Symmetry: D2
Subunit: 282 residues, 4 copies
C-alpha cells in the first residue's frame, strides 16, 4: 500500500498537426525542429532531467520517424566514424533498451483517450504527461521544476500560466485557491469555457504529473480534464508556474519565435542571427 515513484512519462504523439501543412503532411509534427532538435527530443530530455526512466509514446499511423529517432542510426553512426566525426552530437537521442515503449492510438480521439492508451504500461504508479508542442524554455526544465514541487506536496500537479482574456476559451481553466510561492491550489477546472464564463485566467499547460487514480477514472468513463476534476476533493492538486518562457509551437508564429529564441542563446549562432534579425527588421 506504499506509493510508487514516478519513473514514467506519457507522450501524446499521434496528432495530424493539420495546422502546419504542408510541412506536416508526411512528417510528424513532433519532429519539427527548434534549431537542431525535434520537439519530442526536447520533451524527453526534459523528462530525463526530471528523473523519469520510462518514456511511453502513444503514436499514430505515419510516425516511424519518431521511432527511428530514438534507436541506433546504424548507417549514420558508421558514416560519421568513417569521418572521424564524434557521436557526441547524438548524446541523449538513445535511451537504454526498453526505456521507450510505443503503443498505437489507432483512432484519433483526443488527449484523454491517448493517455488512457498507456493504462497497462503505467499500472499503479504516478505518471507524467508532456505535450511536445508546448516548448518550455528554461533551466531547470519544466518537468524538473514540477517534480521538485511534487517531492514536497505530492498528489497531482499541472503547469499553470496566466493567459489573456480573449485566449481563455482555448485552454482548460483553473479556479485558484491559496498561493504558496510557485504553487497555487486548484479548486476547480473547466475545459475551454465560453467567452464570458471564465472562472479566471490561469490555464492548464501541457505538463502534468498525475496519480494512478486518474487512469482508473479514465478507464471507467471508458476525457481528462473532467477526470482530474473528480480528484479535487481528496488529493493535493496544485498548479505550478514555470521559471522560464513557454512557446506555443502549436501555431506557426510560436514555432518561429522559439527557433529565434534558442538560436540567440547559442554561442555559435547568435552573432550571425542577431546581425541578420537587426537588418531584416528595418
Amino acid at each position: 500500500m506504499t506509493i510508487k515513484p514516478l519513473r514514467k512519462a506519457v507522450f501524446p504523439v499521434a496528432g495530424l498537426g493539420t495546422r502546419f501543412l504542408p510541412a506536416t503532411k508526411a512528417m510528424p509534427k513532433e519532429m519539427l525542429p527548434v534549431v537542431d532538435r525535434p520537439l519530442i527530443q526536447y520533451a524527453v530530455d526534459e523528462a530525463v532531467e526530471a528523473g523519469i526512466e520510462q518514456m511511453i509514446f502513444v503514436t499514430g499511423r505515419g510516425k516511424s520517424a519518431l521511432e527511428d529517432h530514438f534507436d541506433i542510426a546504424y548507417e549514420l553512426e558508421a558514416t560519421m566514424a568513417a569521418r572521424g566525426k564524434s557521436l557526441d552530437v547524438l548524446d541523449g537521442t538513445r535511451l537504454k533498451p526498453g526505456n521507450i515503449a510505443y503503443v498505437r492510438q489507432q483512432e484519433p480521439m483526443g488527449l484523454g483517450h491517448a493517455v488512457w492508451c498507456a493504462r497497462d504500461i503505467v499500472g499503479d504508479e504516478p505518471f507524467a504527461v508532456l505535450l511536445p508542442d508546448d516548448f518550455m524554455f528554461g533551466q531547470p526544465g519544466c518537468l524538473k521544476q514540477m517534480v521538485d514541487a511534487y517531492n514536497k506536496v505530492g498528489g497531482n500537479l499541472i503547469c499553470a500560466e496566466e493567459v489573456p482574456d480573449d485566449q481563455t476559451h482555448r485552454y482548460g481553466i483553473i479556479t485558484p485557491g491559496t498561493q504558496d510561492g510557485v504553487l497555487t491550489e486548484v479548486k476547480g477546472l473547466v475545459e475551454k469555457p465560453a467567452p464570458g464564463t471564465a472562472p479566471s485566467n490561469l490555464s492548464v499547460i501541457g505538463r502534468y504529473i498525475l496519480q494512478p487514480e486518474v487512469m482508473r477514472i479514465l478507464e471507467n468513463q471508458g476525457q481528462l480534464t473532467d477526470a482530474m476534476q473528480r480528484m479535487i476533493g481528496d488529493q493535493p492538486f496544485h498548479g505550478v508556474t514555470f521559471q522560464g518562457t513557454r512557446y506555443d509551437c502549436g501555431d506557426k508564429a510560436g514555432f518561429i519565435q522559439a527557433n529565434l529564441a534558442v538560436a540567440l542563446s547559442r554561442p555559435d549562432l547568435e552573432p550571425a542571427v542577431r546581425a541578420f534579425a537587426v537588418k531584416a527588421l528595418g
Copy 2:
C-alpha cells in the same frame, strides 16, 4: 497462490538471415503460412490463452509488424467501396494499448530480448512466444499450457522429444516425474555436446515464466536464468497436443504451408490434386 497470466512477450528483432533473400527487407516474422504471417498466428494463440497485453521487442527494419496490427486506413476504405467484408481482418487489431513495442537496439539474443520488456511486465508472470515455432493444433499451444498453469502454477515450457543427432541444437531437459502431459524439469543444459545429452526432450519456443526470472535477468545484465529457478518453484515441461513446424528452417516453412493448406476446405482439393501429380 498462482498469479494469473495476461502478459506475453514476442521476440521479433531477428535478421532471419536463414531465409535470405526473402528476409532482406522484410521481417521474418511476417512470412505467411498460406495467408497470415507467423506473428499473427502467435498473437491469435495468445489471445485464445487469455492474454491481454502483447509486448513486441522489435528491431530496426520492422515497421510492417507495427502496421499490421493497426488500422489499415486506405485498405479498409477501398474494401468498403467494393462491399468487401472486413471480417477477413478480424483479430488483426486489438484494443488500443494492448500491443506495446520496445526496440531491442542491439541483437544480443533471447535473454536480452526478454529482458527488454522488464518494465512492462513488472512483478507478474509472463509468457514468451517465438513465432518461428509454428504450433498447429487445437486448442493452441499456449492455451493448453495456461490450462496446466492454472493448476500447477510456477514455470512451464513446451517440451518435445527430438532425435539423437538433433539434441545439440536445443536446450535439453533432465526429466523427473511425468503426470500425463506434464513432466518435471530437474535440470537443463543449453545445446549439449553430442554424446553428452541428459535425455531427448528439448525446449520449444513457448514459455510461461514467473517474475523472479526477469529479476534474475536484470541481475546478470538466459536459459541459464530459468534454471536458478528449479529448487524454488514448480517447473514443468508441457507436451503439445498437435504438431509443431520449425519455420526457422526452409523445409519446415514449406511443410507448414502445405499442412495448413490441406486443412483448408477451399484449398485442399486443388492442393492435394497438385501435390499428388507433382510427387510422381
Copy 3:
C-alpha cells in the same frame, strides 16, 4: 529494323486484397516462394532477358519493394561480422539508376499503371511483367520471348491454354497461324462473358510492346483495348512458355509454386518430399 529491348515495367501497386490478412501491411509482391519474393523472380527474369532498366510503378505502403533492391546496410555489416557470405544476396542489387520508381497515386488498373512509365520509356519498346504470374522454367519466360522478338519484332505476349470456365478471367486471343512456339493474334477481348470466348488461349502477365502502344494509352486519357488497335500493322504474336506457370494470384497457386520450387531444391527436396507423402494419406 527491330528496336532492341532494354526496358521493363513492373506494375506493383496492387492492394492484393485476395491474400488478406497477410497482405494487410506487406506488399503482395513481397510474398516469398520459398526464398525470394515474387518481384525478385520477376527482375531476375528480366535481367536474363537482357533488360537493363527496371521501372517500378508502386503504390503507397510499399517501401519494402524499394529497400529490397538497395544495400541493406546493417544486415550486410552484421553478416560480415560473422564471416557469412553475401553471395545469397547476389542479384538483389542492380547498378545505381537501373531501377526507377514512380507512384501510381490512384489504383486505376493495369493500363493506367503502364501509362505512368510513359516518360521513362519514351520512344522505345518495353516489357511488362506481372509478378503474380510465377513463371517456372528456363531459359525463362521473358528470355524465351525476347529470343522470338529478335527475329519477329513487333509485339508479343505470353499465351496459355486455360480451362473453359476460367476464360472469363483473362484477356482472350483469337489465334491465327501457329509457327512452333508462336501463334498470330488476330484479335483479343478482355475478360469475355462465359459463352462468348473466341478461344481458350489467354494473355499471361508477360508482354513486349512497341512505343506506339504508350502513345495510344496517353491518347485514351486501358491496356488490352490498346494492343488491339495494333493488329493490322505490327507483327503481333502469342508466345507459349516452355515451362509451367503458377498463378500466385490465388492461394492455391502460391502454395503449389512453393512446393514445386522446394522439390527442385537439392537441400529441401528430401525433407519436403518425405513430409509431402506422409501428410497426404
Copy 4:
C-alpha cells in the same frame, strides 16, 4: 535552336550530418522553412520555370520525400471530415509519373548523384537543384535562369569560386560563388558516364556557351544552422499573418 528544358535533377541522398540530431532519422531535405520543406520550395521553383519531369536521386532513410509528393490518403480524408480546404496542399503533388525516384545506393558525391539520372534524362538538357540553397525571390532562381537560357542556350549556373570575362547584365561568361542551380547540356551526362566530377563541366567551356547567372533575390545557405534560422525569419516576416507577432518578438528579444 535550343532543346527547350523539361527535366530537373534533385540530389536528395545526403545524410545532413551538419544538422544532427534533427536529421538523425529525418531527411534534411524535409526541414521546414516555416511552412514547407526545402524540396517543396525547390520543386515549386522548377514548375515555375516550366520543368515537367522531376527526378529525385535519393538515399536509404528517405521515404518521407516520396510520401510527401503523393496523395496523403488519411489526411485528406480527415480534412474533408472537417470542412477544411485542401488548397493548403496545392503544388504538393504532380501528375503521376512526373516525379521519378532512383536510389544512389552509395554516397559518392554530386557528380555520381547526377550520373544516376543518366537514362531518365537521356539526350536532353537538364536542370539540377540543391534544395539546401534556399533561393528567396521572385520570380525565383530557376525561372530567371531559364529566361536567360532561351536566349543564349548552352550551360548556365547560378553565381554569387569563379573567374569571369564579359558581363552582360545578369550574365557573365565563365568570386562568383557557384550556387546549387544548374542548367546543363546532355553532353555533360556523357562526360560523367565516361569518367565513370562536376568540375568536368569545364571540359565544356571551349565548345558551348557557358554563363553564370546572378539571382535577383537573396540566397540562404540552409546547409548551416545560422542560414536555416535566417531563412525562416525572412520568410516569416514576408507573411502578412505572421510578421506582426514575429517582428514584435524579434525586436524585444534583441535588446
